Design a protein around this ligand. Structure first.
Ligand SMILES: CC(=O)N[C@@H]1[C@@H](O)[C@H](O)[C@@H](CO)O[C@@H]1O
Ligand SMILES: CC(=O)N[C@@H]1[C@@H](O)[C@H](O)[C@@H](CO)O[C@@H]1O
Ligand SMILES: CC(=O)N[C@@H]1[C@@H](O)[C@H](O)[C@@H](CO)O[C@@H]1O
Ligand SMILES: CC(=O)N[C@@H]1[C@@H](O)[C@H](O)[C@@H](CO)O[C@H]1O
Ligand SMILES: *[C@@H]1O[C@H](CO)[C@@H](O)[C@H](O)[C@H]1NC(C)=O
Ligand SMILES: *[C@@H]1O[C@H](CO)[C@@H](O)[C@H](O)[C@H]1NC(C)=O
Ligand SMILES: *[C@@H]1O[C@H](CO)[C@@H](O)[C@H](O)[C@H]1NC(C)=O
Ligand SMILES: *[C@@H]1O[C@H](CO)[C@@H](O)[C@H](O)[C@H]1NC(C)=O
Ligand SMILES: [Ca+2]
Lengths: 474, 383
């Protein structure tokens, strides 16, 4: 399988539909081909040449959120031909600047750019997503970041102005100058609550969702329950609610850190990898510290109330009222594991497929059955060096059979399943993996694309038909 | 002497404005117009709709509070194609300072039902939406505002009284400036805020009496410069009027240092307007918002400076018959009209059986009251 290495740790990874795979390591962005061997173009954001981390970041506890220079990498306007692809590239450089660029060649010039769009702190969180809103249905960017953090020297001081000291989520107009944010286009943080660490940002049902959790960056501990904020998909901020995520199932002390986030679009179910504290070094490790939980988005929407707890509201101060409602993650769909760090979920034939990353470099795969019940995970790939997997697992937009595995300074192109390992029809269809099927003409278990199809014959036997439908069936 | 054009019944006066020499009086439910001695009335949605504003944009616009949902209408009823009202009228009956220069609207009217007082510039000919930083504008709001040139650039000047609660509750009067065509911030977050806003303390002391609460203001352009008349109130028995030279004020904003900032100021000073398209730098914007007050206090011109009585709510000026570059200052209370002669320094008073609201001078002084509008002054005696 293909592999790409960098001199610096990878901070962000995103794959364009038609244009190459974009990867950001130190202070540079690389446009790689889908085969991960040819760098089509590069972007020296800090200084021409040297991509060495202008500074140095010490990767804390494996459960603690990491530090990075790249804060935002989002390809957009790539659905169909006629408009042209655009790319949003954000960083900690220039007070958390973000620029809009032509999706493709990095040597080209950026169209618009603005400062204070993203968190200027290397360890500060940032999660953004592009959406459509307004009369003309224009493109807007919604960004949630930890903009304010305790900083000593005023020579570097990048914290936003006093009027913007409490801003948590901000809406930007992509066509507007400096990616302008309007007066009523921001959600503010409730004071004294400490800091909020945003994990992801996604669109679902007319609203934008922001998975996060209260986090003290100084002490390195979670000061609350992991939650999700909901806002309407509009030009101005309309707070719709806040709900806590409960995934402390197999753990006696509970799990307060959300490490990875993935929305299963065809299922309307959100997948999250939760974890408890690891002592500090990696002390309190246990076969129950991390877990995978699936939440019904309709339950999140229903339980998210416009109460002021982590965010300021109109007729409520802060924490002087009702508490946020908790949401349960679908029983028996939970996967308790010792060290999970990343997740990506999709629906193949009709079954829910979940890819999991671990702290020792394993890429696991879980296929849900009847009632979204979880089976025993299959190890699809293992990293030689045992490098913990990056919290973002990116699928291949061109080939459905591939998934990009990122860890440390390496990006690999991994096949979603090992079909050829099976050498019998029954032996292969009992495995119940929607990606694999018995190809009658070649007498091998393969992907749908590896087997020749014809309308007059049934050459590729899928899982839905059953193992009993094999030619030799007892 | 005084010709009263009475309404059909006593009205609650909410606001009065002058545009094309036409007096626009806003009442609870309707709006009256007055010009060429004829009174015209156009009734609007009658309930608890307080008409607080009458401005001149591309057309005459009249806005009201409705039943908690601000809306604007055309002079002769109508719908208003622009569908504005949000920042054009408050949600509750209150004082308002909204002005329109050419077609650019500047207002202190709350944009939402949840307080947060700001001085804003809406999207138009002068640029897009702009608003002041947090707590810059007091809960009392802006008391007066006008547009005046400073070089080749137009600037907006506003007056307001700030309350400071450190050890004691102290009120302080200020005059602030900003560029009419100010682009805005330089970040994404501050792109819609004023980048040239500065303020200076105003002084109006007579004999130990230090006036702080601003009531009304009027700016008159002369040959040399612009003279700003400001009437102050006090929790005691007297009120007072002080005048200021706009040239002196412009000099101060232009050359005076910033209180609290001892380091060197940037090549292009903080409150200086930039050419169309140019944006104020980050280093400059960081200073201006943290140090927006000058290390100075503007002293008033020697004359005119007079006092009493407390309770004044409005005033207007009229030049004393082209033979004298002197003036007659008319100001009012609840049931009394006053006139101050700047040459003789004599003040007269006249009682009326009406609840007075304002004095707006055109060719003759108009007195807007709950009963109607009185054209011309009554026979006054030396108070
Ligand atoms: C014209 C332009 O700005 N795009 C250039 C393109 O010509 C060149 O092939 C590419 C390198 O792969 O860099 C970029
Ligand atoms: C919605 C869900 O995931 N649960 C259902 C459960 O209620 C039902 O009893 C079962 C049938 O065996 O199907 C599944
Ligand atoms: C005819 C008459 O006496 N009424 C006038 C009318 O002509 C004019 O349109 C109006 C302005 O709103 O003032 C009044
Ligand atoms: C899956 C789901 O929750 N669908 C909801 C629908 O029930 C609701 O009518 C709408 C509200 O605008 O948002 C969407
Ligand atoms: C570039 O890399 C060098 C190592 O050769 C490193 O020491 C330096 O910090 C980097 N310079 C920058 C900031 O681009
Ligand atoms: C980046 O944007 C700023 C204004 O936001 C502009 O001054 C600068 O020229 C832009 N850079 C390029 C080359 O696009
Ligand atoms: C943040 O951490 C510091 C020390 O690490 C502590 O003083 C402070 O109380 C913490 N904030 C909260 C409420 O978690
Ligand atoms: C699977 O697909 C069938 C159609 O073949 C549909 O009826 C069923 O609802 C789907 N099951 C789920 C919920 O995955
Ligand atoms: Ca869906």
């Amino acid at each position: 399988e293909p592999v790409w290495r960098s001199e610096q740790a990878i901070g962000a990874i995103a794959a364009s539909q038609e244009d190459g795979v974009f990867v950001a390591s130190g202070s540079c962005l690389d446009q790689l081909d889908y085969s991960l061997e040819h760098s089509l173009s590069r972007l020296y954001r800090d200084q021409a040449g040297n991509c060495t981390e202008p500074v140095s970041l010490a990767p804390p506890a494996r459960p603690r959120p990491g530090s990075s220079f790249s804060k935002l990498l989002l390809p957009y306007r790539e659905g169909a031909a006629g408009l042209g692809g655009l790319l949003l590239t954000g960083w900690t450089f220039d007070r958390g600047a973000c620029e809009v660029r032509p999706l493709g060649n990095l040597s080209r010039n950026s169209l618009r750019n603005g400062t204070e769009v993203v968190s200027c702190h290397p360890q500060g969180s940032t999660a953004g997503v592009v959406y459509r809103a307004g009369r003309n249905n224009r493109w807007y960017l919604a960004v949630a970041a930890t903009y304010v953090l305790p900083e000593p020297e005023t020579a570097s001081r990048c914290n936003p102005a006093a009027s913007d000291h409490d801003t948590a989520i901000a809406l930007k107009d992509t066509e507007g100058r400096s990616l302008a944010t309007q007066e009523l286009g921001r959600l503010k943080l409730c004071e004294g609550a400490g800091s909020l660490h945003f994990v992801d940002a996604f669109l679902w049902n007319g609203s934008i969702y922001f998975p996060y959790y209260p986090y003290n960056y100084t002490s390195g501990a979670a000061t609350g329950w992991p939650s999700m904020a909901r806002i309407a998909q509009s030009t101005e901020v309309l707070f719709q609610g806040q709900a806590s995520l409960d995934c402390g199932h197999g753990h006696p002390d509970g799990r307060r850190l959300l490490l990875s986030s993935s929305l299963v679009e065809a299922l309307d179910v959100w997948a999250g990898v939760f974890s408890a504290a690891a002592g500090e070094g990696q002390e309190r490790r246990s076969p129950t510290t991390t877990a995978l939980c699936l939440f019904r988005m309709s339950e999140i929407q229903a339980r998210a109330k416009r109460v002021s707890w982590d965010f300021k509201t109109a007729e409520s101060h802060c924490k002087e009222g009702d508490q946020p409602e908790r949401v349960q993650p679908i029983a028996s769909s939970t996967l308790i594991h010792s060290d999970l760090t990343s997740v990506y979920g999709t629906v193949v034939m009709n079954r829910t497929v979940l890819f999991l990353g671990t702290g020792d470099g394993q890429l696991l795969k879980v296929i849900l059955g009847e009632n979204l019940t979880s089976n025993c995970p299959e190890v699809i790939y293992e990293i030689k060096e045992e490098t913990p997997v990056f919290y973002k697992l990116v699928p291949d937009p061109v080939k459905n059979i591939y998934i990009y595995l990122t860890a440390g300074k390496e990006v690999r192109r991994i096949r979603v399943a090992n079909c050829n390992k099976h050498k019998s029809c029954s032996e292969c269809l009992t495995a119940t993996d929607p990606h694999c099927g018995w190809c009658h003409s070649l007498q091998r278990c393969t992907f749908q694309g590896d087997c020749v199809h014809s309308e007059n014959l049934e050459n590729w036997l899928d899982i839905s038909s059953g193992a009993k439908k094999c030619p030799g069936a007892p | 002497s005084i010709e009263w054009h009475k309404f059909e019944t006593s009205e609650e006066i909410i606001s009065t404005y002058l545009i094309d020499d036409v007096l626009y009086t806003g009442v609870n439910g309707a709006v009256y117009t007055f010009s060429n001695n004829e009174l015209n009335k156009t009734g609007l949605t009658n309930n608890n709709n307080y008409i607080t504003t009458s401005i001149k944009v591309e057309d005459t616009l009249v806005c009201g509070t409705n039943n908690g949902n601000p809306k604007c209408w055309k002079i002769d009823g109508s719908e208003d194609p622009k569908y504005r009202g949000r920042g054009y009228a408050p949600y509750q009956n209150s004082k308002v300072t909204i002005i329109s220069h050419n077609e650019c609207v500047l207002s202190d009217i709350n944009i939402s039902k949840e307080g947060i007082k700001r001085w804003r510039r809406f999207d138009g000919p002068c640029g897009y939406d702009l608003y002041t930083a947090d707590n810059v504008i007091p809960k009392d709001g802006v008391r007066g505002a006008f547009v005046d040139k400073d070089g080749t650039y137009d600037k907006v000047y506003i007056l307001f009284t700030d309350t400071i609660d450190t050890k004691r509750i102290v009120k302080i009067p200020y005059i602030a400036q900003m560029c009419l065509n100010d682009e805005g911030g330089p970040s994404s977050l501050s792109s819609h805020r004023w980048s040239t806003f500065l303020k200076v303390e105003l002084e109006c002391d007579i004999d130990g009496r230090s006036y702080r609460q601003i009531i009304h203001s009027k700016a008159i352009k002369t040959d040399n410069d612009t003279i700003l008349y400001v009437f102050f109130d006090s929790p005691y028995s007297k009120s007072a009027l002080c005048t200021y030279s706009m040239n002196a004020i412009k000099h101060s904003f232009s050359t005076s240092k910033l209180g609290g900032y001892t380091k060197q100021l940037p090549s292009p000073a903080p409150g200086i307007c930039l050419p169309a398209g140019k944006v104020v730098p980050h280093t400059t914007f960081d200073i201006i918002e943290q140090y927006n007050e000058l290390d100075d206090i503007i002293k008033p011109l020697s004359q005119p400076i007079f006092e009493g009585p407390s309770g004044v709510k409005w005033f207007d000026i009229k030049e004393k018959e082209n033979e004298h570059r002197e003036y007659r200052i008319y100001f009012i209370k609840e049931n009394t009209i006053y006139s101050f002669d700047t040459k003789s320094k004599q003040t007269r008073s006249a009682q009326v059986d009406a609840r007075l609201f304002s004095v707006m001078v055109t060719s003759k002084p108009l007195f807007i009251a709950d009963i109607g509008i009185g054209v011309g002054i009554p026979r006054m005696k030396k108070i």
